[PDB]
Design a protein around this motif. Structure first.
Motif, PDB file in Angstrom:
ATOM      1  N   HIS A 193      12.846 -31.745   8.248  1.00 64.91           N
ATOM      2  CA  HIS A 193      11.661 -30.822   8.539  1.00 64.91           C
ATOM      3  C   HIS A 193      10.514 -31.083   7.297  1.00 64.91           C
ATOM      4  O   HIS A 193       9.318 -31.101   7.549  1.00 64.91           O
ATOM      5  CB  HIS A 193      12.291 -29.478   8.454  1.00 64.91           C
ATOM      6  CG  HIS A 193      11.303 -28.407   8.718  1.00 64.91           C
ATOM      7  ND1 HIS A 193      11.031 -27.940   9.966  1.00 64.91           N
ATOM      8  CD2 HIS A 193      10.229 -27.862   7.848  1.00 64.91           C
ATOM      9  CE1 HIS A 193       9.996 -27.042   9.858  1.00 64.91           C
ATOM     10  NE2 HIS A 193       9.469 -26.842   8.758  1.00 64.91           N
TER      11      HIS A 193
ATOM     12  N   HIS B 259       6.815 -32.509   7.686  1.00 63.04           N
ATOM     13  CA  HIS B 259       5.524 -32.193   7.336  1.00 63.04           C
ATOM     14  C   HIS B 259       4.505 -33.083   6.508  1.00 63.04           C
ATOM     15  O   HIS B 259       3.447 -32.624   6.440  1.00 63.04           O
ATOM     16  CB  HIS B 259       5.844 -31.008   6.573  1.00 63.04           C
ATOM     17  CG  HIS B 259       5.843 -29.544   6.884  1.00 63.04           C
ATOM     18  ND1 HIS B 259       5.035 -29.102   7.988  1.00 63.04           N
ATOM     19  CD2 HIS B 259       6.910 -28.623   6.848  1.00 63.04           C
ATOM     20  CE1 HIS B 259       5.470 -27.913   8.315  1.00 63.04           C
ATOM     21  NE2 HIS B 259       6.554 -27.538   7.724  1.00 63.04           N
TER      22      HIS B 259
ATOM     23  N   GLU C 200       3.977 -25.625  11.883  1.00 63.11           N
ATOM     24  CA  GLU C 200       5.339 -25.197  11.993  1.00 63.11           C
ATOM     25  C   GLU C 200       6.076 -25.512  13.220  1.00 63.11           C
ATOM     26  O   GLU C 200       7.290 -25.629  13.337  1.00 63.11           O
ATOM     27  CB  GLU C 200       5.637 -23.818  11.478  1.00 63.11           C
ATOM     28  CG  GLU C 200       5.279 -23.611   9.882  1.00 63.11           C
ATOM     29  CD  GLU C 200       5.883 -24.322   8.969  1.00 63.11           C
ATOM     30  OE1 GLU C 200       6.969 -24.970   9.442  1.00 63.11           O
ATOM     31  OE2 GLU C 200       5.466 -24.609   7.921  1.00 63.11           O
TER      32      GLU C 200
ATOM     33  N   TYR D 192       7.636 -20.338  14.347  1.00 68.88           N
ATOM     34  CA  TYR D 192       8.427 -21.484  14.218  1.00 68.88           C
ATOM     35  C   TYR D 192       9.170 -22.025  15.666  1.00 68.88           C
ATOM     36  O   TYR D 192       8.928 -22.918  15.960  1.00 68.88           O
ATOM     37  CB  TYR D 192       9.621 -21.406  13.070  1.00 68.88           C
ATOM     38  CG  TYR D 192       9.230 -21.349  11.853  1.00 68.88           C
ATOM     39  CD1 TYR D 192       7.931 -20.621  11.230  1.00 68.88           C
ATOM     40  CD2 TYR D 192       9.594 -22.362  10.858  1.00 68.88           C
ATOM     41  CE1 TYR D 192       7.813 -20.769   9.939  1.00 68.88           C
ATOM     42  CE2 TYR D 192       9.256 -22.493   9.439  1.00 68.88           C
ATOM     43  CZ  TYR D 192       8.229 -21.815   9.016  1.00 68.88           C
ATOM     44  OH  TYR D 192       7.746 -21.901   7.846  1.00 68.88           O
TER      45      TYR D 192
END
Ligand code: NA
Ligand code: NA
Ligand code: NA
Ligand code: NA
Ligand code: NA
Ligand code: NA
Ligand code: NA
Ligand code: NA
Ligand code: NA
Ligand code: NA
Ligand code: NA
Ligand code: NA
Ligand code: NA
Ligand code: NA
Ligand code: NA
Ligand SMILES: [Zn+2]
Length: 866
Positions: free
Chosen positions: A293, A297, A316, A377
């Motif tokens: 994750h 990003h 997100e 999210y």
């Protein structure tokens, strides 16, 4: 505290292009010197308005002239009469040791570290703390060499020196312009795991994991997962790392999970440190997820950032989608999808029915730290997945490519991302955009008709979204509704109409519509909303036999699981109503037989079997009801476990034994077998006491890994077995010095079915391993009680609410972000019966009257009491 609104966005009057920071670092008093190169874009007479919180201003210069035309106001430094281009120099002091909120520059044990997202950089200096201001950073750090031998910031080292009196300094530069939320600084004494990754094009990247002294034994899995993440992003998305060094620092005191600061990620230790005797399979896979994750990003968040915080899901939702796709590609896709669906239906749906409901792109925010949500999210990611469903992989990747080509190096919007996908694919997403603007969970109703004279099958599909407290108006969405039709042998019926194939993803765009399928030569059993194709509640009048048929025949593993969930939901609802009438559990023999069949089916993947044999959580159960009875839910979950344990006793033991593994490996086939074995153990723990006690105790003592040990310990607690207290003490005595391992034990204490659980929980506030200063410990004891033991939290005497109020009274002042996470169970009051609502309201009113009520809590309390 005043709401901000998305529709009020305006381009900044001033930009900052370059910033040179110097930190004279000390825990009690840090001195920050910030030299920014600014450019005026608005009107000549507009002042520069800088954000700042709890800063001691020492001086303000403009082009080296001490400045007189400024004023400090609440949260701000307002600087007037400026040239069009200029150098701003601010000197200010801050106090890391006083920073209990863990926002800005603070202390984690003996380390100093930062958290800047969303609006933390303004706790470090006066700045344009908004993510559409992107500047090139250079960062010089000066500190005591013995205390802080490692001085880390974003990018690469460009200068280093030593000073008098035991101080030294390192200066860093990052060539990529960034919003200040991606700034990071770390200072401390660490062990460092060093490795390398060579990108597909041959760029060599130094990988460095910093951990507290003595923790190298727990670092290699996070390093492995980092390299796995980098390789996968190349293979699946064609993206390579763009810098020379990738630093990760594991810190024990951290509010936000982990953070993607460019080239210098800072992680909660929980999502880095693992070894086989300390971490479970789920810990391993969570490390993997979170490492991935933050890495993902780098492109979806850093190279393209957010124009404003109302666009948070742009990074997100997309990055959660990426982490799911990473997990799913490397591991079991079915298990990942199943668990992400469990989260959506249990946890996210509850938020979307709460006073805090918001669209994935919010319209109004008081405290932006309140919007790092299941909605932004997880629902965000379901929305990205719907785009992927509508476009297909190839077109979706074309849209990713166009998004980066357009927006690389910029701050963008949700709308920009949708437009890229639309333009690259030629799929119209105009209607689809409503998913960004509308809150609440749609309810999709399906009725069917089979006409044997014409051999046509007709689906009549309706949608509606109930109003939510934030939006009185709702409209139909563009719902991708995937189906599959099965004949009576279990074979797929080709979808067609008027002689042409029909795509299996139906576009459900209206309040009501019909779909007609031709050449349907047998009455079908439908699989509906395949792989949870839209984040919606489905209403279809299933027979039990249709569902058991899908459990046996459905092609996708997810559909077999989902059918089992639908079958169980009927009987969960039945039995909760019975519980309220004082009546015992009732379950048809044919339902027990369906689960026996799953146990004995040799052809089923054990990963799938384990999930079918994992009952919905109390949180997932709650969302089946309008008014939640948490005691009934908890007692029915237990009674169902006991009934299945009795009816399936021999089969459960046989499968338990068949899945024994003497070697421990963190490998997906092995994980699957263990999850199945431990799923059987949950039921076996509820068998005859003597058998269960021996079986559970023996697994705990003979375990060669924490997955197996914790599974046994959790079953001793859940079933209140004779061995429980001895095993819990043994674990405490072995592991009390290790907070991450004790978190598992605090969770079991907090979620215990024992009648005196609250007394035990309160006593554990004084436990040697517990501290109110550590967000992980708060979460694992207090959070788990409130959020994961709703039966005790919602004790009829109101004792659970009173306990939470006391904890929140502390945390409101200490760490408002953690406080705001913890208040969530109280803001759900309208889902409960009148007497509970009255007590919960009284609790909320008590918190409303706190001296120095945080904005974080204010926002939630005001919505809840409306
Ligand atoms: Na500079
Ligand atoms: Na101020
Ligand atoms: Na800029
Ligand atoms: Na980002
Ligand atoms: Na896979
Ligand atoms: Na704020
Ligand atoms: Na705040
Ligand atoms: Na369009
Ligand atoms: Na029908
Ligand atoms: Na039907
Ligand atoms: Na139904
Ligand atoms: Na729930
Ligand atoms: Na029972
Ligand atoms: Na303690
Ligand atoms: Na709950
Ligand atoms: Zn993220």
């Amino acid at each position: 505290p005043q709401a901000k609104y998305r529709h009020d966005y305006r381009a900044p009057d001033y930009q900052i292009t370059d910033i040179d920071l110097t930190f004279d670092l000390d825990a009690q008093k840090t001195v920050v010197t910030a030299v920014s190169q600014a450019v005026r874009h608005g009107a000549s007479d507009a002042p520069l308005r800088l954000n700042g919180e709890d800063l001691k201003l020492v001086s303000v210069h403009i082009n080296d002239e001490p400045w007189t035309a400024w004023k400090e106001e609440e949260g701000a430094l307002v600087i007037s009469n400026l040239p069009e281009r200029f150098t701003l120099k601010i000197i200010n002091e801050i106090s890391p040791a006083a920073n209990t909120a863990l926002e800005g520059l603070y202390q984690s044990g003996d380390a100093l570290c930062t958290q800047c997202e969303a609006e933390g950089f303004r706790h470090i200096t006066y700045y344009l703390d908004r993510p559409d201001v992107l500047a090139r950073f250079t960062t010089k750090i000066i500190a005591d060499k013995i205390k802080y031998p490692f001085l880390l910031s974003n990018g690469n080292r460009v200068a280093q020196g030593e000073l008098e009196n035991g101080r030294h300094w390192v200066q860093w530069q990052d060539p990529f312009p960034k919003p200040c939320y991606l700034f990071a600084l770390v200072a401390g004494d660490f062990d460092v795991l060093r490795d390398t990754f060579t990108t597909r094009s041959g760029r060599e990247v130094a990988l460095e994991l910093y951990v507290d002294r003595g923790n190298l034994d727990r670092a290699p899995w996070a390093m492995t997962s980092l390299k796995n993440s980098m390789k996968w992003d190349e293979e699946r998305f064609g993206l390579e790392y763009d810098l020379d060094i990738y630093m990760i620092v594991a810190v024990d005191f951290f509010n936000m999970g982990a953070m993607e600061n460019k080239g210098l990620n800072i992680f909660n230790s929980k999502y880095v440190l693992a070894r086989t005797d300390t971490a479970t399979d789920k810990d391993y896979l969570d490390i993997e997820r979170v490492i991935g994750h933050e890495y993902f990003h780098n492109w979806t968040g850093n190279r393209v950032t957010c124009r404003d915080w109302f666009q948070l899901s742009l990074k997100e939702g997309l990055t959660v989608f990426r982490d799911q796709e990473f997990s799913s590609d490397l591991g079991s896709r079915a298990v990942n999808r199943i668990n992400n669906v469990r989260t959506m239906r249990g946890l996210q749906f509850a938020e979307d029915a709460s006073p805090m409901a918001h669209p994935i792109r919010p319209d109004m925010v008081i405290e932006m730290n309140n919007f790092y949500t299941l909605t932004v999210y997880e629902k965000g990611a379901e929305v990205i997945r719907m785009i992927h469903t509508l476009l297909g992989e190839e077109n979706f990747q074309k849209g990713m490519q166009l998004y980066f080509e357009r927006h690389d190096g910029s701050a963008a919007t949700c709308d920009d991302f949708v437009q890229a996908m639309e333009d690259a694919s030629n799929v119209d997403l105009s209607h689809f955009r409503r998913w960004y603007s509308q809150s609440g969970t749609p309810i999709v109703t399906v009725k069917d008709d089979y006409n044997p004279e014409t051999e046509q099958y007709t689906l009549t599909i309706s949608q509606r979204t109930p109003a939510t407290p934030d939006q009185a108006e709702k409209q139909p969405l563009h719902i991708p509704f995937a189906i599959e039709l099965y004949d009576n042998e279990g074979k797929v019926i080709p979808l067609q109409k008027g002689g042409h194939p029909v795509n299996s993803v139906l576009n459900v765009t209206q309040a009501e519509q019909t779909f007609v399928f031709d050449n349907v030569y047998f009455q079908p059993v439908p699989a509906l909303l395949c792989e949870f194709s839209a984040p919606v509640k489905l209403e279809y009048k299933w027979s039990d036999q249709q569902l058991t048929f899908l459990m046996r025949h459905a092609r996708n593993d997810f559909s077999r699981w989902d059918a089992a969930q639908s079958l169980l939901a009927t009987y969960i609802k039945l039995n909760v109503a019975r519980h309220q009438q004082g009546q015992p559990l009732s379950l048809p023999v044919h339902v027990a037989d369906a689960f026996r069949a799953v146990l004995l089916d040799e052809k089923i993947d054990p990963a799938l079997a384990a999930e079918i044999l994992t009952l919905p959580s109390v949180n997932e159960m709650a969302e089946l009801f309008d008014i939640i009875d948490p005691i009934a839910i908890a007692e029915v979950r237990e009674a169902l476990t006991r009934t299945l344990a009795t009816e399936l006793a021999d089969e459960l033991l046989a499968i338990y034994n068949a899945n024994y593994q003497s070697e421990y490996r963190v490998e997906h086939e092995d994980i699957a077998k263990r999850t199945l074995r431990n799923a059987c153990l949950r039921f076996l723990a509820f068998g005859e006491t003597h058998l269960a006690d021996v079986l559970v105790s023996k697994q705990f003592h003979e375990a060669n890994n924490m997955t197996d040990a914790l599974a046994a310990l959790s079953a001793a607690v859940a079933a209140q077995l004779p061995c429980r207290d001895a095993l819990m003490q043994e674990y405490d005595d072995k592991w009390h010095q290790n907070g991450l391992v004790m978190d598992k034990w605090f969770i079991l204490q907090a979620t215990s079915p024992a009648a005196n659980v609250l007394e035990t929980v309160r006593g554990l506030l004084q436990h040697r391993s517990f501290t109110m200063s550590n967000p992980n410990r708060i979460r694992s004891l207090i959070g788990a009680f409130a959020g994961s033991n709703p039966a005790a939290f919602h004790a009829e005497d109101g004792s659970g609410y009173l306990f939470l109020v006391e904890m929140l009274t502390d945390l409101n002042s200490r760490n408002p972000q953690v406080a705001s996470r913890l208040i969530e169970p109280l803001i759900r009051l309208k889902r409960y019966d009148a007497k509970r609502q009255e007590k919960m309201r009284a609790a909320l009113e008590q918190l409303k009257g706190l001296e120095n009520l945080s904005g974080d809590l204010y926002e939630k309390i005001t919505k809840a009491l409306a």
